[PDB]
Design a protein around this ligand. Structure first.
Ligand SMILES: Cc1cc(C)cc(O)c1
Ligand SMILES: Cc1cc(C)cc(O)c1
Ligand SMILES: [Zn+2]
Ligand SMILES: [Zn+2]
Lengths: 194, 194
């Protein structure tokens, strides 16, 4: 339902060498090319700084997709709106998202959400350039979730991967909740600032 | 046409969370997300070093697309081969490309090429992140032209932007020729190196 409905917002305007998702102009980019940039940033600026750059990039993506979701608001419950994030992330070929348990009420500022990530392009590309890492690696993907749901909730919602293929697990798994639920919350919120 | 023949190689598996162009996995990325990262890379690394990173990302992309083009080469001429570059760049929503004059013989190592760029995304995004620039800004677009043509020729063929929207012009225009056939060429080459 969501996928096939949000997918109609994706448009290819070749007369103008352009691709549009709702109101945001998009490009098709090779994962290997974005992987090479990551290798460069990590090799020179260091892993933890490269991780902030990517999380932040993903954040900005997430916020934009939330604004598109807001326009198609009417007729959707709070879960329906939230769902659109996982849907656009999947359409964008970033990851296959399966929403498991989602507790949301925007009016009350309620949010607790856990999702499954399959075929994460990011974990799958960090490994090709860096082998297995001893910490979750889908930086840009976590950034997106955080930005989207934060835009949607109108308060800081932070996400973390509980499991990542970049660490050598069968899947990535993530959890998102208010900044008051996270033990290292202020340290996590810091990463999203230039 | 090039765009129709090359469209058959773009596979959207929305029920997979993936996108493939030939045998390269792609993502759809918000140009505004790329702009954000560009701003942080300039602000902290400086214009020139940021530029190197984007040109090299473009280069990786153009090289992968030339591999795709070399697959479909049954009865296509050298120009037909070359023309797949500009086509792919368009399909990817990067720019609207119009070849102006192009002399190419792959066997003979000859290449002289001139191209019109309309609605270049990169010049658009730069302008919104930094204002008008005091030199050509379509870095990844250029890297791409270089990388693709070079892989197709088996010979280093560099491009430069002769005119560009990011600088105040109504469009971008570019020149591609042999490496050493450039004055500071040996210096342009240095930017395609980590
Ligand atoms: C907005 C969003 C939310 C979740 C849980 C995953 C994703 O890929 C995107
Ligand atoms: C390989 C290539 C060549 C030209 C002229 C434009 C472009 O966007 C890519
Ligand atoms: Zn992961
Ligand atoms: Zn330009």
């Amino acid at each position: 339902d969501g996928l096939s409905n949000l997918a109609r917002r994706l448009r290819f305007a070749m007369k103008e060498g352009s691709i549009w998702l709702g109101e945001q102009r998009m490009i098709l980019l090779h994962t290997a090319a974005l992987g090479a940039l990551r290798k460069e940033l990590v090799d020179t600026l260091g892993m933890e700084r490269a991780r902030g750059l990517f999380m932040r990039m993903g954040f900005h993506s997430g916020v934009r997709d939330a604004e598109l979701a807001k326009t198609m608001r009417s007729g959707h419950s709070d879960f329906g709106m939230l769902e659109m994030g996982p849907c656009l992330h999947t359409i964008e070929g970033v990851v296959r998202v399966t929403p498991l348990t989602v507790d949301i009420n925007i009016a009350a500022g309620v949010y607790h959400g856990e999702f499954l990530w399959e075929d994460s392009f990011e974990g799958d590309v960090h490994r090709q350039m860096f082998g297995v890492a001893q910490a979750p690696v889908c930086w840009m993907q976590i950034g997106y979730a955080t930005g989207y749901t934060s835009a949607l909730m109108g308060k800081t919602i932070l996400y973390r991967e509980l499991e990542c293929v970049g660490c050598g697990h069968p899947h990535c798994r993530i959890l998102g909740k208010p900044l008051e639920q996270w033990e290292d919350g202020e340290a996590e919120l810091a990463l999203y600032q230039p």
